[PDB]
Structures are given as C-alpha cells and as structure tokens.
C-alpha cells in the first residue's frame, strides 16, 4: 500500500473530502489518498445491491437478468422507481423497493449466512431485514469493498459462477475502445460511494471511493473525482 | 418488414453503398433501406468470430475469457495481432490467427455439425477448415445474421448458456447511460460488416449492416453510418 496525498487536490478543487482506493491487479498493489479513511467502515447503502443481487440469484429469488419485477403500485418520489424493472434497470436506477422485496424473500437467516460466506464487511445484518444496509448495523470499508470485488471479478465468491456473471453484467456502467467500467453507486445522507473496477486490455484496476455528502447536491462528484484520479494515474485517457 | 429509402441518404452522403437492417424486438418488426441487399449473402469475415467463439467455448477449446492464447511467434502486418491475447482482446482486435487455431482444434466435422445446429447462413464450410469464413464456401445475409443474433441474445442457440453469456460479454463494444452495444465488425477485400444489437432499458434493437469497401480507408463508416441510422430512428440520442 502506498499513500498519494496529491489526489486530495481533486477533492479540494470540489470543496469536498473523501477517499479513493485503487488496486492494480497485475502488480497486486494498492494506492490511496488516505490510508486511515481507506480502512474506516461505513453503511454500504446501494453498493449493497451487489451482494444482494448475488444472493437473490443463487437462491432463485431472481431467475435471471430478464425476469420482471412488477411495480407494487406504490408511487415513490423517484420517478424511475414507479414501473416494472429487471436486474439491469433495477441496478441502473438503484431501485430500493425491488431489493427490499428481495431481502424479505431471502430472509435474515440465509442473508446472514451468505454475507458471512462472502466475508462481507462486518457481516452484521442487525436492524430490519429489508433495510439494514441503509439504516442498520452493517459496515464496510473501501479496502473491504475492494477485497469483495476482487473475489467477484474472479468468480471466487461462494455462489454459482452463473450468478456472478449475471451480476457483473448488471454492474456494467460505461464502455468504449479504451476501457470498461463495471460498478455500483451508493449514498446514505452522510456518505456517497462508488465502487467497482476498470477493465483494460491487459490489466484490471479495482476502485472504491467514498466522500462526505451533506446534501445530494454533489452526487455527480462520486464519479467525477474518481475519474480525475483515474486520469492522473493514466488508467484512462 | 418495412423499406425506408431515406436511410440511403446516409450512404450516398459518404459516396457509399450498402444496407442497414434493424429489428425491433418488442414489436417483432424489421426495417431496412434495401430489402433485397438485406437478403444478399456474403462471406462473414470476422463476424464469424461470434459462432467460432461459441463453438470453441462449448468444446473446451477455450476455457473462458481470461485464458491466454500465446502468440505463435510469427509477426503479421497488424501490430495488435503480434502478442498474447484472450477472448476479449482477440475479439476487439479481430485477431485472425487465434481463431484459425481454434478452427483447427474444433476440426471440420464438429464445425460443420455446429453451424448446422446454429442454422448459420448457408452452413457451407468448404474448403479450408481454418479459412473458410475468409475465402471459402460460407455465405450469410444481413437478415440471417439477425436471426442468429436473436437466438444468441436469448441463450437459445444449441450450446451451453455459459458459452453464450461469455461470447456476449466478449461482444461488448460500447456502453453509457443511454444504451449498450454488443457487436462484431468484419471486412474482406470487398465488403465491410457490422452486426450486433443495441440494448435499451425496455427494448433491444438488432442490427446487421454491410457496405461496399473497395479500400480499407472507409472502415470507420461501418459504425458511423449505422449510428446515423440509429440516430434518425431515435433509437439513440
Ligand atoms: Na486477486
Ligand atoms: Na471535476
Ligand atoms: Na452521413
């Protein structure tokens, strides 16, 4: 692990504070602007959709990325939520109600057992079974997110290979001739997250970032600051 | 099927001639600028890399998208070919020697049986087992490319689901907040190809295009013209 404080200028430039963690898979080396915060644990919020999806697929709660999760007829503030969804759109729009239903069907016992099998964060599901990742006891750090993602990337998690391939497909965020990003956003009213990885032709760079997010004003910063770090390190052009 | 000659404006504006074929999956309806050229069969060239990959995966000739195909040590004109590759980079840079090796390992008998099971084009693999898609007997039309691709999209081809998911991952070309394109380019001395699909939140649009390609100058037009048509049809912004 190497600390590079020069990344802090990207945060300063945006009147923000946070951590970016990068892992170079080929070199097995990590880099971050703040080693201490890199190892501090926070509520995952919607980044929890990654393990939740995996578990739901492995248990058959979700069949595949095409199955329709019918809208439950309750109108909610976020317009995109008020419609039918599949795994791809549910991830893309972070549709909380669909995942809450998943969590209820999974149940606390299977949920707790799976997170333990995954070595996921503090592995604590205390609170409501359908909301612990938003306001309950579970915590994970940026470095822990990287460890978890590395296992997912290599199909090493304790679910089927098929479930893992499907979730990586659903994580697809951006792709062009230069790179591919597979990732998940999250935010909880105190912290904003972006975790995932960048696929290059001959390497993979895992990333996990979080930042203080007093208002939702700055949500776009999660990707922007990360990309500035990626640009500075020449990972993307 | 519906003919839209207005699309010809995009070809002529580039001093070009060709066909674009679109299929709206939800509505089960197709659109083309030239109904007859849509059904004209040509050598598939590198678009054959899609069935070739599926077969190699299903037979274990390829383990997965990470397996290294070591460079055989012969230097060829295209700089990107002269290195080790995996399925992702082999597709991205259309690395013919790797696929030629796959074809030799698959062998004529299994190749022929699989293309028949695929209902692929004219199913004719004469003569050279490692070059028939470049100079041999096989011919496929833009509409036939679409039929094959629709089966691949739904995991309905007669190979494992896993094989189909891996090849679709390897087809990934472009992705953003508005769309995902999975596709494969091809070109022989005479014609250039682009075939694949556009994933939207609530629909999939299949496409297959081919155009006259007297020089390799114009290869960029395969994507550009196709995108102008997608833009016109309001499929992408
Ligand atoms: Na690793
Ligand atoms: Na910025
Ligand atoms: Na044009």
* Helix intervals (H) in A33-190: 35-38, 49-59, 87-92, 96-106, 108-118, 132-135, 142-153, 161-170
By the CB criterion, residues less than 5 angstroms from ion ligand 3 are: B 10, 13
Cα A156–Cα A161–Cα A139 angle in degrees, nearest 5: 50
Contact between B87 and B166 under an 8 Å Cβ cutoff? The reply is yes
Tokens of B103: 């074809």
Separation CA B167–CA B57 (nearest Å):
9
Domains defined along chain A, listed by start: 1-237 (3.40.710.10)
What resolution in angstrom units was achieved for this structure?
1.7
Nearest to B162 among A92, A162, A176 (CB): A162
Q: Is A94 helix (H, G, I), strand (E, B) or coil?
A: coil
Decide if B175 touches A, using CB distance below 8 A. yes
Bridge partners (DSSP) listed for residue B183: B196
Tell me which H or E stretch contains A224: helix A221-232
- Listed in sequence order, the residues at least 6 apart from A163 whose beta carbon sits closer than 8 Å to its beta carbon are A54, A57, A58
Contacts of B123 (CB under 8 A, 6+ apart): B112, B115, B116, B138
d(CA B52, CA B170): 12
Nearest-angstrom CA–CA distance, B60 and B75: 27
CA of B220 to the centre of ligand 3 (A): 12
Which active-site residues of B does the annotation give?
Answer: 46
What single string gives the DSSP state of each residue in A45-72?
Answer: GGGGHHHHHHHHHHHTSS--TT--B---
Q: How far is CA B35 from the centre of its chain?
A: 20
Rounded Cα–Cα distance for residues B41 and B44 (Å): 9
Residue corresponding to tokens 């099998």: A117
Is B22 in contact with B206 (CB distance < 8 Å)? yes
Using alpha carbons, select from B20, B3, B36 the residue that is nearest to residue B224: B20
Nearest to A165 among B165, B176, B201 (CB): B165
Nearest to B237 by CA among B161, B178, B170, B157: B178
Cα(A95)–Cα(B167) distance, integer angstroms: 29
**Using a CB cutoff of 8 Å and minimum separation of 24, what contacts does A173-182 make?**
A173/B175, A174/B175, A174/B176, A175/B172, A175/B173, A175/B174, A175/B175, A175/B180, A176/B174, A176/B175, A177/B92, A178/A236, A178/A237, A179/A235, A179/A236, A180/B172, A180/B175
Measure the CA angle with vertex B206, ends B106 and B120; round to 5°: 30
CB-CB contact of B22 with B198 (8 Å): no
Length of chain A measured in residues: 237
Q: Which residues of A206-218 are buried (b: 16+ CB within 10 A; e: fewer)?
A: bbbbbbebeeeeb
Q: Which two tokens stand for residue B159?
A: 């190979």
Q: Which residues of A touch B199 (CB under 8 A)?
A: 88
> To which residue do tokens 């390609």 refer?
B213
Contacting residues of B for A166, CB less than 8 Å apart? 165
How many residues belong to chain B? 237
Contact (Cβ atoms closer than 8 angstroms) between residue B82 and residue B71: yes
Answer whether B140's CB lies under 8 Å from B38's CB.
Answer: no
- How many Å apart are CA A213 and CA A193, to the nearest integer? 9
How far is the C-alpha of A142 from the C-alpha of A207, rounded, in Å? 8
Task: Return d(Cα B36, Cα A24) in angstroms, integer.
Answer: 51
Helix (H) or strand (E) holding B28, with range, is none
Query: Sign of torsion, CA B158 B163 B165 B167?
Result: negative
Going by C-alpha positions, the residue among A33, A31, A32 that lies closest to residue A5 is A33
Is A162 within 8 Å of chain B by CB?
Answer: yes
What is the SS3 assignment for A150?
A: helix
Beta strands in chain B (DSSP E): 2-3, 18-24, 29-32, 41-42, 140-141, 172-175, 180-187, 191-199, 204-212
State whether residue B172 sits within 8 Å of chain A by CB.
yes
Q: Which of B216, B217, B196, B214 is nearest to B205 (CA)?
A: B196
- A169/B165 CB distance under 8 A: yes
- Which candidate, A32, A30, A26, places its Cα nearest to that of A4? A32
Catalytic residues of A: 46
Helix axes B49-58, B142-153, angle to 10 degrees: 40
Q: Which of B155, B175, B196, B203 to mutate to test the interface with A (most CBs of A within 10 A)?
A: B175
List residues bridging with B42 in a β-sheet.
B140
Contact (Cβ atoms closer than 8 angstroms) between residue B181 and residue B198: yes
Is residue A148 within 8 A of residue A118, CB to CB? The reply is yes
Element (H, E) at B183: strand B180-187
Q: Rounded distance, CA B118 to CA B53, Å? A: 13
CB atoms within 10 A of CB B154: 12
């Amino acid at each position: 692990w190497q600390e590079n404080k020069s990344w802090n200028a990207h945060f300063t430039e945006h009147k923000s504070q946070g951590v970016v963690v990068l892992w170079n898979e080929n070199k097995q080396q990590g880099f971050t602007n703040n080693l201490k915060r890199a190892n501090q644990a926070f509520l995952p919020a919607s980044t929890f959709k990654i393990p939740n999806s995996l578990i739901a697929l492995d248990l058959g709660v979700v069949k595949d990325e095409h199955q329709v999760f019918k809208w439950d007829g309750q109108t909610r503030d976020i317009a995109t939520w008020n419609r039918d969804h599949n795994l791809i759109t549910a991830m893309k729009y972070s549709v909380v109600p669909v995942y809450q239903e998943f969590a209820r069907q999974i149940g606390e016992a299977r949920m707790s057992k799976m997170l333990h099998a995954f070595d996921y964060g503090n592995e604590d599901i205390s609170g409501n079974v359908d909301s612990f990742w938003l306001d309950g006891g579970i915590r994970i750090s940026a470095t822990e997110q990287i460890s978890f993602l590395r296992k997912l990337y290599h199909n090493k998690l304790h679910v089927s290979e098929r479930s893992q391939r499907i979730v990586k497909q659903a994580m697809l965020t951006e792709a062009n001739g230069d790179y591919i990003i597979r990732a998940k956003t999250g935010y909880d009213t105190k912290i904003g997250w972006w975790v995932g990885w960048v696929e290059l032709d001959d390497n993979v760079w895992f990333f996990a970032m979080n930042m203080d997010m007093p208002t939702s004003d700055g949500l776009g910063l999660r990707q922007a600051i990360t990309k500035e770090v990626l640009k500075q390190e020449k990972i993307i052009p």
